[PDB]
Amino acid sequence: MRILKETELRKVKVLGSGAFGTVYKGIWIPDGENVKIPVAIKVLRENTSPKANKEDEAYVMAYVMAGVGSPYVSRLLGICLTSTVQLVTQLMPYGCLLDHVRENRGRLGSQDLLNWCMQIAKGMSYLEDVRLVHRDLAARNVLVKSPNHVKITDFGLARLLDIDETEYHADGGKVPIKWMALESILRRRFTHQSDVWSYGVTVWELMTFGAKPYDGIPAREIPDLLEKGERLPQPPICTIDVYMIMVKCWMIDSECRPRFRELVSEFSRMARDPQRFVVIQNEDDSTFYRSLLEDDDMGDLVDAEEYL
Numbered sequence: 001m002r003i004l005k006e007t008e009l010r011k012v013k014v015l016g017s018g019a020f021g022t023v024y025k026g027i028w029i030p031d032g033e034n035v036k037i038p039v040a041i042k043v044l045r046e047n048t049s050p051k052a053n054k055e056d057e058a059y060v061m062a063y064v065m066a067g068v069g070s071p072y073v074s075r076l077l078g079i080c081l082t083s084t085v086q087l088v089t090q091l092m093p094y095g096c097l098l099d100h101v102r103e104n105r106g107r108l109g110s111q112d113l114l115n116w117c118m119q120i121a122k123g124m125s126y127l128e129d130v131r132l133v134h135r136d137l138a139a140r141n142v143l144v145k146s147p148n149h150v151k152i153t154d155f156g157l158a159r160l161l162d163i164d165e166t167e168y169h170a171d172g173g174k175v176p177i178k179w180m181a182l183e184s185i186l187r188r189r190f191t192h193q194s195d196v197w198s199y200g201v202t203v204w205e206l207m208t209f210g211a212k213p214y215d216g217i218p219a220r221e222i223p224d225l226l227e228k229g230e231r232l233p234q235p236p237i238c239t240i241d242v243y244m245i246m247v248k249c250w251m252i253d254s255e256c257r258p259r260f261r262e263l264v265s266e267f268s269r270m271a272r273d274p275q276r277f278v279v280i281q282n283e284d285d286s287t288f289y290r291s292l293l294e295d296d297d298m299g300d301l302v303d304a305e306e307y308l
């Protein structure tokens, strides 16, 4: 990890938003050098609370230097603290898995879908091992490094800021209701078992080629819907065996939901005989991986880890 000077970073375009901040595609030019390194920069939104502390690098570094040892979860390469807090990581070149499945639909294979499910479970299992509750797992937060390598991103900030998302009014009151466990919606309780609920929704997004969960149902009606027992429907390509795992992730009793270590072993087992568990149908050409680097100068590095 490095402390970056503001002259080292340049934002080149906005990529999108998530809790607490906006993500930009940027260029990192290490101080004193000429090489250009594509990065993603999350800029935290300013805290609008009048009673908030008006006031460092050490405090932020201590909180964000966590979970740096899995292939399946992102890690920061640097921070830059000035008037704003900038968190910097390698840019994942193929974007998010949500866009990938939406663009490829029926060109996908069962083996790829189950492999991604197993890698996401591996990343979450690692986050559970390092005692870091994610709070916002969704397919938009699963990034594509290469076709056979995905990484979970965007975690650690609620506990850095010691702030419930709903009380960070700079986020405009938006929360990912349709991915959240009931206890997170009603009581703002987040645990590794509520992450398991979000994992089930993420698997559902992948197996529907990126459908929107509960499409057409207003977020305000979701708690009543769940309390009455209604759940997301069976994706057409999923056997009942795979759908049963998703239903277990959505039980109101959080202790009865699967554990990530068991999800890793179940999806590794299914990924070894994929056509027995996922059947992509005629109703649903090679897949295209769309690059976030397609407009970058060829001399720029492709991955910050190449940098010495």
Ligand SMILES: *CCC(=O)N1[C@@H]2CC[C@H]1C[C@@H](n1nc(-c3ccc(Oc4ccc5c(c4)ncn5C)c(C)c3)c3c(C)ncnc31)C2
Pocket: 015, 016, 017, 018, 023, 040, 041, 042, 064, 065, 066, 074, 075, 076, 087, 088, 089, 090, 091, 092, 093, 095, 096, 097, 098, 099, 140, 141, 143, 153, 154, 155, 156, 157
């Ligand atoms: C396809 C989906 C999509 O277009 N988007 C989703 C949501 C909005 C856009 C941006 C895209 N995206 N985000 C990041 C990313 C996310 C978080 C982040 O901040 C942290 C903070 C702490 C942290 C992190 C990451 N990893 C570990 N720890 C402790 C950053 C800096 C960046 C993307 C990246 C890195 N590459 C590509 N696309 C990204 C997701």
Ligand SMILES: [Cl-]
Pocket: 251, 252, 253
């Ligand atoms: Cl239950």
